[PDB]
Symmetry: C11
Subunit: 70 residues, 11 copies
RNA sequence: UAG
RNA sequence: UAG
């Protein structure tokens, strides 16, 4: 329960924060839809070993800040 | 019990701080409602592996500060 | 017993520092009332995985300082 | 025995440093009274998961410094 | 679930973030395709011990920032 | 054996460095008397979970420096 | 899975990133060929205890940056 | 064997670095006499949970520097 | 597999990065030859507890940089 | 095998670096004599929990630098 | 395999880096000869708990830099 | 002010 | 001042 997390703020409506499955298989297991201004703070977990961000969003991680673009 | 935590201060009435379930399923298990000025300090836990904030709030984490402005 | 803690100083009478239960359920288990100037230094624990502060207070954590308002 | 600790210096007589019980119950298990100028350095422990300071005091923790104020 | 991760932002359509297999074999097990502006945040894992980036992308890791231009 | 420790230098004779008992009870288990200028460097232990200093002394801990006053 | 990693960006075609075997024996187990601008982010692993770069590349590690010359 | 240590340099003859017993009891188990200029680097251990310095000495610990007087 | 590593860049042909055996015996178990411009990134391992560099090379470690000379 | 170490450079002939026994007893178990300019790099260990330096020497530890005087 | 290490560069021919035995006994187990310009990077290990450097060399450790003299 |  |  003490894994790294990412912070995502939607800069438009309809931002998708997609969790990709951990393991031999890489598939979507959940897409969280964010409207403009909403903030998601999401860890890496047993089930999520990669996170894809689609849409305009501001992203903070341990490694710095970045914006995704639509 | 020594997991990371976030600090959330409501900037308006009716902010929701939503805990999303850890595991194969991603659903809401609790939404804490905050009125303007209230502060919630919340950990990641066995049950919560993601936190969604709806409404205007000031947020502090290990990675910096940010404001939500959804809704 | 080495988990993080938060410091809270009341800036008025009747501040409430509320422990929310750890686990599948999220309810109050204790509400600590602080009068003006009193300081509480409180850990996250087996029983408390979130803390809610109601009333005017100065708060320090590992992530910075912040004030709660009424 | 390597838990965090707090430093408290009394700025008047009759300062109370109160240990609150770890566990499902939250009650006092000890109040250490300090007279002006005395310093207490006290850990979080199996028995103590929150500490309340009543009266005027100067306090140092990992997260900085703060003064409690008395009535 | 607390391994390092990398941050990749596609700078053009068709970027490939390729996971190379951990172990005695070094083959591809997944290629994630990114459209311009999308961000992928990907850990090292049981199954992934090297990552290859094809296409123009901006990359953040623990050791600094870099742009691929393949 | 790697617990935190405090440094105490007596600034007058008869300074008392008091170890308070770990556990459900909080009583004195030892008081070390220090003559002016003597330095004591004392750990937290199985037996000592709080330290009280009585009399004028200069104290260093992980969290900074402070003087006790008599 | 939390071992250190190296970042390598080829500055010309034909760069080789060579994994040398962990253990009593030291031999090549894999050679990854990189075309100009491509980035490889590669861990030390059960199988790889040393990495050789041939050809012109820019390298980032925990200890700073360096360029190989081919 | 990776506990904290202290560094003590005698600034006069007859400095005493005293190890106080770990445990329910607090007594002396060893007093090391140092002559002017001698340096002792001493850890906390299974047997030593507090160190008292008597006489004029310069002391370095993790928490800063200080001098004993006698 | 997360032990320290060293980075070595040959500044001339015929540089030898020599691994010395861990254990009661200290012997050579591998000499890696590096030509000008090549970079070797090498860990301490089960089998290697000391590394010797012969010839002109630039070296980065945790403790700073240094050049060997032929 | 990763406890703290100290660095001792002899500033004159006949410097003694003395390992004092870990445990209930504190006695000398080894005296390493250094000639002027020699460097000894010495860990704390299962056998050595305190180190005494006699004679003129420059000493580095985690806590800073100091010279012993003869 | 993740203990501290030292970096030693010979400043003249005939430098000796001497590993002293871990344990109750302190003897030589190995002397590595370095000629001018050679670099040895050597760990503390099961067999080596102190290192003696004889001859002119430049030394880097976690605690800083120092030069040994013949 | 005990060792 | 031994290895
Ligand atoms: N009972 C919840 C409390 C909680 C912690 N963090 C949260 C964030 C959002 C909502 C609820 C929570 C839990 O242990 O997980
Ligand atoms: N139930 C999901 C929640 C989650 C965490 N991080 C995510 C990133 C994206 C999507 C969902 C998530 C999980 O525990 O893995
Ligand atoms: N008995 C409570 C005491 C406590 C710790 N942190 C708190 C925060 C708020 C309220 C009470 C507490 C517990 O161990 O969990
Ligand atoms: N016997 C108490 C001593 C203590 C430590 N920290 C405290 C804070 C307040 C009051 C008492 C204490 C305990 O071990 O928990
Ligand atoms: N299922 C993959 C997801 C993944 C993580 N990091 C990656 C890097 C590249 C491609 C896929 C991935 C894994 O657990 O390993
Ligand atoms: N025997 C005591 C020694 C001690 C350590 N720290 C102290 C602080 C005050 C008084 C005595 C002590 C113990 O191990 O706990
Ligand atoms: N299958 C290889 C992949 C790899 C990781 N790092 C490398 C460096 C060079 C070459 C291949 C690799 C391994 O797990 O070891
Ligand atoms: N097979 C060797 C590879 C190696 C690692 N570090 C080295 C340094 C020098 C020479 C070889 C190596 C080992 O695992 O130990
Ligand atoms: N034999 C003592 C040596 C020692 C370590 N630190 C000390 C401080 C003071 C006096 C003696 C010591 C012990 O292991 O504990
Ligand atoms: N075989 C020796 C190699 C070695 C490591 N560090 C050294 C320092 C000096 C001499 C030899 C060594 C050992 O494992 O311990
Ligand atoms: N055999 C001794 C070697 C040693 C390490 N550090 C020392 C300091 C002084 C004297 C000898 C030593 C030991 O392992 O403990």
């Amino acid at each position: 329960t003490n894994s790294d997390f990412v912070v995502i703020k939607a800069l438009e409506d309809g931002v998708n924060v997609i969790g990709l499955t951990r393991g031999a298989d890489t598939r979507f297991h959940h897409s969280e839809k964010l409207d403009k201004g909403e903030v998601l703070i999401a860890q890496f977990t047993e089930h999520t070993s990669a996170i894809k961000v689609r849409g305009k969003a501001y992203i903070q991680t341990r490694h710095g800040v970045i914006e995704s673009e639509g």
